[PDB]
Amino acid sequence: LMTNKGTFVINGTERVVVSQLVRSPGVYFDSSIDKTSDKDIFSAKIIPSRGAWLEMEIDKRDMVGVRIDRKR
DNA sequence: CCGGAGCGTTCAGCGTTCGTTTATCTCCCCCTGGCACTGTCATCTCCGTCAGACCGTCGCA
Method: cryo-EM
- Spacing of A24 CA from B17 C1' in Å: 96
Cα–Cα distance list, A29 to A32, A43, A45, A55, A59 (Å): 10, 6, 7, 10, 14
Which residue, among A17, A43, A45, A22, has the nearest Cα to A32 in the 3D structure?
A: A43
Which phi and psi (to 5°) does residue A41 adopt?
A: -125, 130
Q: What is the C-alpha separation between A2 and A27, in angstroms, rounded? A: 35
**For the CA atoms of chain A, what is the radius of gyration?**
21
Q: What is the C-alpha separation between A17 and A7, in angstroms, rounded? A: 8
| A52 in contact with nucleic chain B (CB within 7 A) | yes
Instruction: Name the nucleotide nearest A22; use CA and C1'.
Output: B48
Contact between residue A3 and residue A21 where contact means Cβ atoms under 8 Å apart: no
Which bases along strand B come within 7 Å of a protein CB atom? 45-48
Q: What is the C-alpha separation between A35 and A45, in angstroms, rounded? A: 23
CA dihedral A35, A37, A41, A45 (to 10 degrees): -90
Nominal resolution (angstroms): 3.3
Cβ partners under 8 Å of residue A44, min gap 6: A27, A28, A29, A30, A55, A56, A57
Contact between residue A48 and residue A38 where contact means Cβ atoms under 8 Å apart: no
| A53 in contact with nucleic chain B (CB within 7 A) | yes
